[PDB]
Every structure is written in structure tokens, then in C-alpha cells.
Amino acid sequence: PTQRRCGAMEVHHRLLRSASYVRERDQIENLALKYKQGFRAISRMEIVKIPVVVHVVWNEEEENISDAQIQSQIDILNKDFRKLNSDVSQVPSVWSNLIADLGIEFFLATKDPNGNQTTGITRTQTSVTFFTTSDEVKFASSGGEDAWPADRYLNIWVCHVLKSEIGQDILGYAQFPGGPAETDGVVIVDAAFGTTGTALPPFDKGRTATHAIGHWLNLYHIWGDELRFEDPCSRSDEVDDTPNQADPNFGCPSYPHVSCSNGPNGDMFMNYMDYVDDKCMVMFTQGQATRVNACLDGPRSSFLAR
Ligand SMILES: [Ca+2]
Ligand SMILES: [Zn+2]
Secondary structure, eight states: OOOOOBTHHHHHHHHHTTSHHHHHHHHHHHHHHHHHHTSOOOOOSSOEEEEEEEEEEESSTTTSOOHHHHHHHHHHHHHHTTTOOGGGGGSOGGGTTTBOOOOEEEEEOSBOTTSSBOOSEEEEEOSOOOOOTTOTTTSGGGSSOOOOOTTTOEEEEEESOOBOSSOOBOSEEEOOTTOOGGGOEEEEEGGGSSSSTTOOTTSTTOHHHHHHHHTTTTOOOTTOOSSSOSOGGGOOOSOTTSOOOSSOOOBOOOSOOOSSSOTTTOOOTTBTTSOBOTTTOOBOBHHHHHHHHHHHHTTSHHHHTO
């Protein structure tokens, strides 16, 4: 009974408290709001390629993932984000003209933050076995490689065991943009990372990382969130073109799944921000991309200028 469980929202409550994150998060949403209404939409017509470093923390070598495994994930992302995935053909025709190309690929930096030529994969032996939504795997003191600077690279943590504060075993999380630097990255368990090696289905397509990436582009789950105290229909992903559902669908669904009306269009289970299996989450919406655009210009302005 392995269910998809994303702790990124569990991070989000705990993010609020220092209020340093609160200042940035308000500024971050006004851009993503003003972009939403249409106000300013000067669009870049060049895709941006983004440097990425993977931190493997292995308690055992079997946990330590092969490099070939790491690449299979890297490739599948660059297929997913430019409308290149073979899976895009599974979207119902109702939304064929709504599928989007984020206009984004990424790479494993030739250079580490100090300048020397680097692979892009740090491997750290750790004595710990479990890891939490406490983000303790990110920091060095807790058996997890120090995060590389947030403006130069996008940090990655891959470990064997990921758990929630509730205890329910998670596949990964993500820290929202404008967040404090040393956590400004995403973590995915080793069995959801890539298309081979220790990667296992229904996370062998590696879309599990794709999903928690979207939180790094400031994408809410389609349903709003369960962090949010509300009647389930009044929590929304602030994306107009995705049908506002309230219940995540896991596994693979039968078209259509009707949540908070939106019938007969049904839920957008094909969206990577739903909890479906990897082979059924295939695409990103035009609205979502527009939200990504707003995350890139103001919060992440560093990466565009490279
Ligand atoms: Ca929506
Ligand atoms: Zn998530």
C-alpha cells in the first residue's frame, strides 16, 4: 500500500513562523497574482537552463544511487517541462490546447559554487537512517550535505527513507520559493528518483521529482491544500485553467473524476501536481507556467541573468 505523500506543504506551515519567509512570500504572490489577471506579461522568448546539484546521502551503498540512475531523472525532467514527454498524448482532447511548455530545462553544473569543475553529484555517507519534514537531511550537522547557494544552483537531496511528522512515509517534499536559503531546494527519496537503478514504480518514470519541483516553481497542489483550514472547495491552486478540485487522486484514474463539480471536464489528474502514479501525470497547464514565469522574474531573478 505505497501511497503518494508530499510533505512540502508540511514544510509550508513551519515556514510561516519566522515571518522572514512571510515578508518574501507576500511579495512573491503579488507578482503571481498580477501575472494571473494579465497585468504584466512580458514573456521571455528564450528558454532558461538551470544548474543543479544532487546530494546523495547513503546509509548504505545500495541506497547510494548509480550515476546512470541520476541522469535518467535529469533527462525525464527536460522531456516533461518542454512538452517533450511521450506521455503528453494521454491528455483528453478537452485540454489538448491547454497543455503547456514551461520553456525550461536544467543541467548538472560543470562548476561547484567555489568555481572548480564538479560532476553535479555529492555523495555523503550518513549514520542516520530516517529523514523527516524537519529538513534535517539538508544540513550537514544532521548527516546531509550542506546546501549549495540558492541563487547559483537548485539543490537536490536523494536519500533512502523519507517520513512525515505524522509518520506517513513520504516520497519527497519541496521548499517554496523565497524560502530561507539553506533549505531552498527539493528532496526526493531514492526510489522515486529516475528510471533505473534503485528507482521503483509507480515512480520509475521519475515524475515524482517533477511534481515536488513545481513547488520550487511556486505551484500549489491542484486541490489547494490540507494545510489550509477551509471547506475543501474554497482552497485553490490559484491557477484559473485547472478545474478546482479538492481531493487528490492517486494511482491511475478513469476519466472523468468530478471534484467540486467541474463536470464533465473532471479533475486534471494528468497534471503533475496531482498525486497520481508517474505514467498518468504527464503535463503542465498554461496557467501554471504563467505562475512559474512570475516565480522566475521576481523571486528567482538570479537564475535568468546567468
Ligand atoms: Ca485551478
Ligand atoms: Zn507536493
